[PDB]
Design a protein around this ligand. Structure first.
Ligand SMILES: [Mg+2]
Ligand SMILES: [Zn+2]
Ligand SMILES: [Zn+2]
Lengths: 1112, 101, 14, 170, 221, 111, 94, 147
DNA sequence: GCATCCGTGAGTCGAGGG
DNA sequence: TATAATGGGAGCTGTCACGGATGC
RNA sequence: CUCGA
């Protein structure tokens, strides 16, 4: 169908690769395509450079490294639950200083995980994502003292775990102090150690009135740098002997040592820019020619004394400013844990050099790869910023890789984060999306990168702008930092332009984020697009300008919760970004070059290019993702089809013809229906389930292990004690469920038999054994069955046996069986539906087609939405989506309406007019006039002022259609609704939250080991937790026996719950509850604290609640 | 070994009997007495002593024989006829079949 | 405060 | 954490009386399971308790006669509906359950205010009072229809709101 | 009969401020520092907001959500405090037999401090309705006996007599003056506000009081 | 009887020894190969009671007919295994040690 | 709402005393197999089954209806607890 | 609350405020064993004062003492209620030293032990109530009459 | 009398996931 | 069972308010 | 920790 696009804004540049923040960072760190001699000092290369050489053989030195090919491909790794990684080899040489002997060898350091093409990782078979982190950029900062107005604090901040923060404060007594590891000492003392003299400090710092007299201490200048160094050492190290060489080593490490103290590369530039100096190294000082040489200390103290005195040119700093905040990408976060793991290997090296023979040693003997593997293995497994990938739809994956977290290791702890870190800073513009962010406690901590935004080599985020010279807007695009941007005046993207020249004599612009109205002469730069202000998901919301930010947040966040539907359709009204997202997410298959398609198959597509070469593209089909949604590729092309470069081949999951499809386009009628849509609830037509709208495929993986025990080995077998053929019907010879069989709750997936525990038959068992004359079997039924409320058709079986080629399991494990059970989920009652505007609700009712409100021509509506949802939420976008969707219904055309530049009301009115001629005009040609019911509604409309009195019925119906309203007939009556109802097409998605997964119930079941209270969780078949606030509820009602029930019979009372279940099944009332077991645990846990807890009667005589069991 | 606090909330208690099993053993002990009441006070007692439903342990044919006073040959066929009369009462009523698992 | 340092000091007495 | 409890997504029934709530069959079968076994023995649906339990273990082994038995079980009895957080005592209320097809719990519109529960995907937990005492406490004191007013104010807590008010005003 | 207007008036959905944004100007907005932007959005959601106008607004929206987030944590803490302090309080008896009471004022000093004016209706009902008179009250030729539970109409009557200058304050049995040990009595507490009748002995008012105070804790801005 | 009161107080070493069913001498848990309680260890059945209901360690007395009877060979009492959640052990220190609660809780109760 | 619940709250000096009375009576009926009921055959609460009307299995339902008739006596220390138990077991065997 | 449009009865607040005034400080021992500066409940000091006055002794001079809910909760007589709240270590130590006995007066105490809360259907007021039909009531009345 | 270091708190329920 | 060697390494910190011991 | 309310 034809697609009409609106807006006058022409994007000069397209969107940058969206996954580049992941891919480019990890490529920058690895440098695997770079020859070892051409590698820079950045990345894992740096880690070798910092760690080596290792002295005190004697010297073990680093040469170069390399990365071998992965032992298993990506798909095979997910299968065997291995990690996709490359082997790391490093060439080292052992050098004895005295002997001169040189032994060189290439050592194996273990494997380093590799990032996939799309920007994610595979760890132990599970796809994971490394979330970028945001923190305070290293450098020198100055902030106003909260306690002392007019006085300021100098803060020198290095990288995380790169060494301590340092504070320079002017004390109430006038002296200038320094804070290191929470220690207050006069800065003058350290200055002497740097070699400074009163002669130098007076000329330099004397220009600032009476700040220099707090720096003057005669006792400090009365001693040489060697004496003051030992003086400082005693202050910072109580109890440690003040040895001269141990004093130098501490200060050197604390200050001059690059191997320990390191400012960021950005931290260096930030210090240079702020202090107006140049840093030789990345440290605060240097050890040169036997002494210490100052770098950052003097210019910092100079800047503080100038700011305090009021000397112009010195201002405080905004720590929330995006120029002072940077981003730690996947490459930097991995490097640090690689840097730590390397230093741990170094500690093993120096320890190895002290032991063993001093003559014969090889780099292979010294190097233990274990501490390096562990540090990496932990970072891709147990790290906070390493998260389980969200695969639910292709947009979920793209957004997850574009996330920014202020939390995590080295970042802000929760109790630390206030309003300031959470707030949207004026510098977030074009960089961090103001819309997308979690609801609740996570707000402002987790954000999303802007569409056009870019993270530079220094870690800061840059946004594009257009060069404007003399009122002429060029195509030159300049990515600026938050600091660079503040220097100019930047006009808005919608600024009127005739050709390349500014049309308006008054334009809207920003100066340091502050909006201002200026002339074309005063305009230095111009926004590229309105798209640069918002994230990817927020840019998928049409008519965003008509939606309140709070609901747009939800509409944005809920698109990633969208479940791919078998029938899924692209939105009738789009933002135009639907194509790029599909491409960058690598969901769809595309044509590499020009050529002709040789073959088209469900599993396969073969293409012959202009080169003449035959390229076979295998198609991913019904693969289970992380969240359990089905990921499959459907070929969009036919045999012999001529295709160009970049042309669609196969449609990925949640995609239609190369466009992003998160849901269905349905015809909605906005009106209350019988309290069924009451409070955000939704009423849907049964016609949706008939044509299979909102139906998705879901897969659930089941696993079981046979292991060797001391009672004998467990085994997968078709022989299960005490089971009929009916139970074993779909099981194969080996005891595994066949492919294509329908499984229901209680059915057996994989049969397994384990030897019974050592068993003393009770008298009831021995007598029952002799009655039926049957010997008790050795094994018992351990078989893996289907968990209650689950089921489907088994599409796959995977079996790994010990003693078989390519198969080695964990110790003790014989064989591991994996059963993949898929399902086809129809939309039902309790499933959650939502639109792109933030409107969301569960379906409360499904009406048969004849009960649905319908059009005059007989066409019933799909979804009935409650109009009460609109006014309080203030999102009008769905209303405009519906109006324009109405026209698209009868015009058979979709629309591209970009954010903030799109179809205005009159433009939609023009389309609705054309829609009316097709809708109504068809009727008058079919030989039908106006219905009686239509006139009754028109009479009502005249009273409503929706139509102008006196016009013909047709002219008034058109006036209603232009308002997007139509005459609606109740299906139950046939009588019309007393007024015209807004009806049109809307794009609605099915969210991942479904009633099938969320329903749970328990009578009795498993209990925790100690507490003896029901387990938590659905998978464990546990009970619902009744908390403190719920106990208060029963208390406030005053129901004691309902409360005493929850505290005893239903949870922890072992005598009570056993007696209760037996009472009910016998048809007897439940017995009086006894003492809860968790209280006895409390008593005993208190006894371990040497506290005597005595339960006493009214006579103060102890009462044993353990019934003589614990008393000798 | 690994720490419980790493995770202990995901671990079931396999030792103590669930109310289902507790009631199952209780309904078994009652149904057995319903079957043994259809026998004589002796042949029901011999079966209880032979399988140890009284003092908890299973006596030999000499001890049950000496308790009742009869020869070991006699007390063994009293056990048999009590077991045979239980087999006939079981095939008719079919009450104890469900407990055989 | 630090048990190790306190021990190393008592060792430095002899 | 307690036994005889379950949870699911809530959906508004219009048709429920103020004292009623839709309770899914599959949940009620599990929640009332010890009672259901007893009723099954009182009828010819099963020889004994253990035979009846094994009958319900497999879904395909569940026939039509057991539901009609379950209806007799829950007659006159009430469950407890609760939504977190519970700010005040009305965060838990007593309802006479009505078996429904589907996996969703049905909630009466007028008590939504007291629960502060909307239809946007809120879930609620079910609790079943066992003893004749706990059923007497629930029915008399904790019944939704038995508390019409707020203990904090004394103004009506359950009152027309949203669509009901819009319809009356029209 | 305009749909937005109807829902606003009826009390079904929306308030004047929310309706204004759909029709009139969006209004003034806040800088992240709490300062207010000199330039308000002149747009309405009907008309649509520019990309700059949208961005200016997100400062407040973010501040608002983050405020609510950090607020609910502090409200929940307060609620738990109130419960733990008031939990042992339950009505243990019909009457403690105290001669002590509190005087509920119907008049509050004006901010001009010119004179005394009548308190708002809602405020008087809050400290009057459902409480027991500790002394005989004769107003407007009506006798309200000592020991009487004041109904809603009994309160509106007392308001009328106040407007007539007959009664400036109402003696009332209060938990402040209640002498009952380990809790309160029936007379001092007054009505059970749920049943609009005298409180049933054995009712725990402590938890009820704590919950009542805590509940709209997330509502306080 | 019915409990009307709960009292908490200080436990004397003699009181502590009275609760104790034995001293745990060895810092051992279970035998590595047999996965059974080590003698005089933390899990020892001689002290804290039997693992299996009414059954000793060696298996000499397997039935309820022996109750309160302490086996001669393995020294394990024959009784319900539920007592393993109940019976206290004790450790006798060579030198007295202060209870940290009465030290670091300010102001110190010992101080 | 429970039928005549307004009247029941008038019979008692506390809303909770009503519950204790209703609950205890519901236990007396269950234990004695509803032989002690003060309800006439036409006053019997009925449950509609697949077949037809049958007695209401709910003991609490009956208790509330019995209480409405005023044929039950409630209060404290009317009869010794143990003596009250066996006088019912004599009249209505369990 | 009024500012936010929340209708709330004054008496609810009065319950809490009452618990804030629950304690007093001694300005002089008089004839008692009490100490100057010692803090105790207003109930127990007046109960001692009426005993000393009845004994003709000198009553204890005390001061009204206001404390916030958090402190009032930890200052409660029941140690089970206090330790279940916060500062468990500080609470348990002083409770163990004094050999304190909990009478289980409040709700929280009984909730822990799993006993019947002294409120509503579990209140001693209504919990001893008996139910008897006239047929049974007259059956016992004749047994009493014959004896 | 009054600054300062230490210890103690900082919402509920339910999924998933390592 | 015997060259002789004799003082550790770890360390990123963006909140608030309370009582209370600690010091000038 | 990430989500749902
Ligand atoms: Mg909700
Ligand atoms: Zn009183
Ligand atoms: Zn033994």
């Amino acid at each position: 169908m034809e697609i009409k696009r609106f807006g006058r804004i022409r994007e000069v540049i397209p969107l940058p690769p969206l996954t580049e923040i992941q891919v480019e960072s990890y490529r920058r760190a690895l440098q695997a395509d770079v020859p070892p001699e051409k590698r820079e000092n950045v990345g894992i290369q740096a880690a070798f450079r910092e760690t080596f050489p290792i002295e005190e053989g004697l010297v073990l030195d680093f040469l170069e490294y390399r990365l071998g090919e992965p032992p298993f491909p990506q798909d095979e790794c997910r299968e065997k639950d291995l990690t996709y990684q490359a082997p790391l080899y490093a060439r080292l040489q052992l050098i004895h200083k005295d002997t001169g002997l040189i032994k060189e060898d290439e050592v194996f350091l273990g494997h380093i995980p590799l990032m996939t093409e799309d920007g994610s990782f595979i760890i132990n078979g599970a796809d994971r994502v490394i979330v970028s982190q945001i923190h305070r950029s290293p450098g020198v900062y100055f902030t106003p003292d909260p306690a002392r107005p007019g006085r300021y604090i100098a803060s020198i901040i290095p990288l995380p775990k790169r060494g301590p923060w340092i504070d320079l404060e002017v004390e109430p007594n006038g002296v200038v102090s320094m804070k290191v590891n929470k220690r207050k000492f006069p800065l003058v003392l350290l200055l002497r150690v740097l070699g400074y003299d009163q002669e130098t400090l007076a000329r330099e710092l004397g220009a600032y009135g009476e700040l220099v007299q707090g720096l003057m201490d005669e006792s400090v200048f009365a001693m040489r740098p060697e004496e003051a160094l030992i003086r400082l050492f005693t202050l910072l190290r109580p109890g440690d002997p003040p040895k001269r060489d141990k004093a130098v080593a501490y200060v050197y490490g604390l200050i001059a040592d690059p191997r320990r103290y390191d400012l960021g590369e950005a931290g260096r530039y930030k210090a240079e820019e702020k202090l107006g100096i140049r840093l030789s190294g990345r440290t605060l000082a240097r050890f040169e020619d036997g002494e210490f040489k100052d770098e950052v200390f003097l210019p910092t103290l100079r800047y503080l004394f100038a700011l305090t005195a009021g000397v112009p040119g010195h201002e405080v700093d905004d720590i929330d400013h995006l120029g002072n905040r940077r981003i730690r990408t996947v490459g930097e976060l991995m490097t640090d844990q690689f840097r730590v793991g390397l230093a741990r290997l170094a500690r093993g090296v120096r320890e190895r050099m002290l032991m063993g023979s001093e003559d014969s040693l090889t780099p292979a003997k010294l190097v233990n790869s274990r501490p390096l593997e562990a540090a990496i293995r932990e970072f891709f497994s147990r790290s906070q910023l390493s998260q389980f990938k969200d695969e639910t739809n292709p947009l979920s994956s793209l957004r997850h890789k574009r996330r920014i977290s202020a939390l995590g290791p080295g970042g802000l702890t929760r109790e630390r984060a206030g309003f300031d870190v959470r707030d949207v800073h004026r510098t977030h513009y074009g960089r961090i999306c103001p819309v997308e962010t979690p609801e609740g406690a996570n707000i402002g901590l987790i954000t999303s990168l802007a569409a056009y935004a870019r993270v530079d080599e220094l870690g800061f985020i840059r946004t594009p702008y257009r060069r404007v010279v003399g009122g002429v807007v060029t195509d030159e695009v300049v990515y600026m930092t938050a600091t660079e941007e503040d220097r100019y005046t930047i006009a808005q993207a919608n600024t009127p332009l005739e050709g390349n020249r500014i049309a308006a004599e008054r334009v809207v612009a920003r100066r340091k984020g502050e909006p201002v109205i200026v002339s074309p002469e005063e305009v230095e730069f111009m926004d590229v697009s309105p798209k640069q202000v918002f994230s990817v998901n927020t840019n998928l919301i049409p008519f965003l300008e008509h939606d309140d930010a709070n609901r747009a947040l939800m509409g944005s966040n809920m698109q990633t919760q969208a479940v791919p539907l078998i029938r899924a359709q692209a939105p009738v009204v789009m933002t135009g970004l639907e194509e790029r997202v599909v491409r960058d997410s690598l969901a769809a298959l595309y044509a590499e070059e020009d050529g002709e398609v040789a073959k088209v198959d469900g599993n396969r597509i073969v293409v012959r290019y202009e080169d003449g070469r035959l390229v076979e593209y295998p198609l991913r089909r019904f693969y289970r993702s992380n969240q359990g949604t089905a990921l499959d590729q459907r070929p969009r092309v036919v045999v012999g089809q001529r295709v160009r470069k970049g042309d669609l081949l196969a449609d990925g999951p949640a995609s239609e013809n190369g466009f992003l499809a998160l849901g269905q386009n349905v015809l909605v009628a906005i009106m209350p229906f019988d309290g069924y849509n009451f409070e955000d609830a939704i009423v849907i037509s049964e016609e949706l389930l008939k044509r299979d709208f909102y139906t998705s495929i879901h897969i659930e993986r089941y696993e079981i292990e046979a292991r060797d025990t001391k009672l004998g080995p467990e085994r997968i077998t078709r022989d299960i004690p005490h089971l009929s053929e009916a139970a074993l019907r779909d099981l194969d010879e080996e005891g595994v469920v066949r492919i294509g069989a329908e499984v229901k709750p209680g059915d057996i997936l994989v049969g397994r038999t384990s030897f019974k525990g050592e068993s003393e038959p009770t008298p009831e068992e021995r007598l029952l054994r002799s009655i039926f004359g049957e010997k008790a079997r050795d094994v018992k039924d351990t078989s893996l069955r289907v968990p209650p409320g689950e089921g489907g058709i088994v599409v796959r079986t995977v079996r790994l046996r010990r003693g078989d080629p390519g198969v080695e399991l964990k110790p003790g494990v014989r064989e591991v069986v994996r059963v993949y059970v898929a399902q086809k989920r129809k939309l039902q009652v309790g499933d959650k539906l939502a639109n792109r505007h933030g409107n969301k609700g569960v379906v409360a009712k499904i009406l048969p087609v004849e009960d649905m409100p319908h059009l005059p021509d007989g066409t019933p509506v799909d979804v009935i939405l409650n109009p009460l949802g609109v006014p309080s939420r203030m999102n009008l976008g769905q209303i405009l989506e519906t109006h324009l969707g109405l026209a698209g219904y009868f015009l058979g055309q979709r629309y591209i309406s970009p954010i903030f530049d799109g179809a205005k009301e009159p433009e939609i009115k023009e389309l609705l007019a054309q829609a009316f001629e097709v809708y109504f005009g068809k009727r008058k040609g079919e030989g039908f006039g106006v219905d009686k019911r239509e006139v009754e509604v028109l009479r009502r409309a005249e009273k409503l002022g929706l139509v102008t009195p006196g016009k013909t019925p047709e002219e008034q119906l058109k006036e209603l259609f232009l308002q997007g309203k139509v005459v609606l007939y109740d299906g139950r009556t046939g009588e019309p609704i007393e007024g015209p109802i807004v009806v049109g097409q809307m794009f609605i998605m099915k969210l991942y939250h479904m009633v099938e997964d969320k329903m749970h119930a328990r009578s009795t079941g498993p209990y925790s080991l100690i507490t003896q209270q029901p387990l938590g969780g659905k998978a464990q078949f546990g009970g619902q937790r009744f908390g403190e606030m719920e106990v208060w509820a029963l208390e406030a009602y005053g129901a004691a026996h309902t409360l005493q029930e929850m505290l005893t019979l239903k949870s922890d009372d072992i005598e009570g719950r056993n007696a209760a279940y037996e009472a009910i099944i016998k048809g007897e009332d439940v017995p009086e509850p006894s003492v809860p077991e968790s209280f006895r645990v409390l008593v005993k846990e208190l006894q371990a604290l040497a506290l005597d807890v005595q339960t006493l009667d009214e006579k103060d005589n102890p009462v044993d609640i353990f019934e003589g069991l614990a008393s000798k | 070994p690994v720490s419980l606090e790493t995770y202990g909330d995901f671990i079931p208690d396999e030792h103590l009997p669930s109310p289902v099993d507790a009631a199952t053993q209780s309904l078994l002990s009652e149904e057995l007495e319903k079957a043994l009441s259809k026998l004589s006070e002796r042949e029901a007692m011999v079966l209880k002593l032979r399988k140890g439903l009284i003092d908890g342990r299973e006596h030999t044919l000499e001890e049950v024989g000496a308790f009742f006073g009869v020869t070991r040959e006699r007390i063994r066929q009293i056990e048999n006829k009590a077991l045979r009369k239980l087999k006939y009462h079981e095939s008719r009523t079919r009450k104890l079949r469900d407990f055989l698992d | 405060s630090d048990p190790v340092r306190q021990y190393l000091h008592e060792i430095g007495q002899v | 954490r307690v036994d005889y409890s379950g949870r699911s997504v809530i959906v508004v029934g219009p048709q429920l009386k103020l004292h009623q709530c839709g309770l899914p069959k599959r949940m009620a079968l599990e929640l009332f399971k010890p009672f259901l076994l007893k009723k099954m023995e009182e009828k010819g649906i099963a020889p004994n308790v253990k035979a009846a339990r094994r009958m319900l273990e497999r879904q395909r082994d569940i026939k039509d006669e057991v539901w009609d038995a379950l209806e007799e079980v829950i007659h006159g009895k009430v469950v407890l509906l609760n939504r977190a957080p519970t700010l005040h005592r009305l965060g838990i209320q007593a309802f006479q359950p009505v078996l429904v097809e589907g996996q969703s719990i049905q909630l009466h519109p007028l008590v939504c205010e007291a629960f502060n529960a909307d239809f946007d995907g809120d879930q609620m937990a079910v609790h079943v009072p066992l003893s004749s005492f706990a059923q007497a406490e629930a029915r008399i004191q904790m019944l939704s229809a038995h508390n019409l007013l707020s203990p904090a104010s004394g103004e009506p807590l359950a009152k027309p709101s949203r669509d009901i008010i819009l319809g009356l005003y029209y | 009969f305009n749909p937005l207007y109807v829902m606003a008036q009826s009390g079904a959905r929306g308030n004047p401020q929310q309706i204004r944004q759909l029709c009139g100007l969006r209004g003034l907005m806040q800088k992240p520092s709490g300062e207010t932007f000199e330039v308000p959005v002149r747009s309405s959601f009907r008309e649509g907001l520019t990309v700059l106008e949208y961005f200016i607004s997100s400062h407040g929206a973010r501040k608002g959500g983050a405020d609510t987030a950090l607020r609910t944590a502090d409200s929940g803490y307060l609620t738990r405090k109130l419960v733990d302090v008031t939990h042992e309080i339950v009505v243990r008896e019909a009457d403690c037999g105290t001669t002590n009471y509190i005087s509920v004022p119907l008049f509050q000093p004006d901010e001009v401090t010119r004179s005394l004016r009548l308190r708002k209706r809602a405020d008087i009902e809050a400290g009057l309705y459902g409480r027991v008179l500790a002394r005989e009250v004769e107003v407007l030729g009506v006798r309200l006996e000592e020991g009487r539970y004041l109904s809603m109409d009994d309160v509106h009557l007392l308001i009328k007599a106040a407007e007539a200058g007959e009664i400036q304050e109402v003696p009332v049995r209060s938990p402040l003056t209640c002498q009952t040990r380990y809790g309160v009595c029936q007379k001092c507490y007054g009505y059970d506000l749920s049943m609009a009748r005298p409180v049933s002995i054995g009712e725990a008012v402590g938890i009820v009081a704590a919950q009542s105070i805590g509940e709209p804790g997330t509502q306080l801005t | 009887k019915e409990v009307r009161k709960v009292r908490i107080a200080l436990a004397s070493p003699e009181k502590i020894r009275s609760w104790s069913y034995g001293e745990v001498e060895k810092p051992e848990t279970i035998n590595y190969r047999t996965l059974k309680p080590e003698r005089d260890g933390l899990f020892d059945e001689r002290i804290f009671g039997p693992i299996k209901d009414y059954e000793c360690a060696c298996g000499k007395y397997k039935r309820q007919r022996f109750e309160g009877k302490v086996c001669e060979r393995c020294g394990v009492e024959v009784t319900k295994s539920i007592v393993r959640r109940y019976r206290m052990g004790h450790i006798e220190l060579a030198t007295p040690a202060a209870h940290i609660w009465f030290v670091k809780d300010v102001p110190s109760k010992i101080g | 709402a429970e039928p005549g619940i307004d009247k029941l709250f008038g019979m008692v000096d506390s809303k909770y005393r009503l519950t204790v009375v209703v609950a205890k009576r519901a236990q007396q009926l269950l234990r004695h197999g509803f032989k002690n009921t003060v309800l006439e055959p036409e006053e019997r609460p009925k449950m509609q089954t697949l077949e037809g009307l049958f007695d209401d299995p709910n003991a609490v339902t009956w208790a509330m209806k019995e209480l409405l008739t005023g044929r039950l006596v409630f209060g404290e220390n009317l009869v010794p607890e143990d003596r009250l138990q066996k006088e019912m077991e004599r009249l209505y065997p369990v | 609350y009024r500012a936010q449009g929340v209708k709330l009865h004054d008496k609810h607040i009065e319950i809490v405020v009452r618990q804030m005034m629950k304690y007093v400080e001694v300005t002089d021992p008089g004839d008692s064993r009490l100490l100057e500066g010692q803090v105790l409940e207003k109930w127990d000091v007046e109960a001692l004062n009426e005993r000393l006055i009845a004994e003709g002794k000198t009553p204890v001079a005390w001061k009204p003492l206001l404390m916030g809910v958090t402190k009032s909760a930890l200052s409660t007589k029941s140690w089970l209620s206090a330790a279940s709240f916060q500062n468990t270590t500080h609470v348990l130590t002083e409770a163990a030293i004094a050999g304190k006995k909990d009478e289980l007066i409040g709700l929280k105490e009984n909730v822990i032990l799993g006993r019947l809360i002294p409120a509503g259907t579990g209140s001693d007021f209504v919990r001893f109530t008996q139910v008897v039909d006239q047929k049974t009531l007259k059956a016992i009345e004749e047994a009493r009459k014959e004896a």
